[PDB]
């Protein structure tokens, strides 16, 4: 809650209220899904006799 848009310390800004920011849990996906390319003609896993 910003009592007044003006900057600089003053009487109005004294009454401001704050709350914590929402949490995020960014991490690697389950089973590392998506790290390896699957089912794309552009990038196809190759395994063959040399």
């Amino acid at each position: 809650y910003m009592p007044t848009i003006k900057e600089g310390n003053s009487r109005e800004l004294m009454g401001q209220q704050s709350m914590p920011n929402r949490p995020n849990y960014i991490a690697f996906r389950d089973n590392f899904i998506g790290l390896m390319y699957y089912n794309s003609t552009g990038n196809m896993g190759v395994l063959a006799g040399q």
Partner: protein
């Protein structure tokens, strides 16, 4: 104008991408892995230049 079906002035052959031929809906015609791609007559490849 011109009649490419009659006169022979075909000009759209550059827009073909893939041709797949299958007999009895289970057997591909060049059925001995006689192509680099498995069972398709891949005419033109997009930017996916493996």
């Amino acid at each position: 104008g011109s009649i490419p079906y009659l006169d022979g002035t075909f000009y759209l052959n550059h827009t073909f991408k893939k041709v797949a031929i299958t007999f009895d809906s289970s057997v591909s015609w060049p059925g001995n892995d006689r192509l680099l791609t498995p069972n398709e007559f891949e005419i033109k490849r997009s930017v996916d230049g493996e």
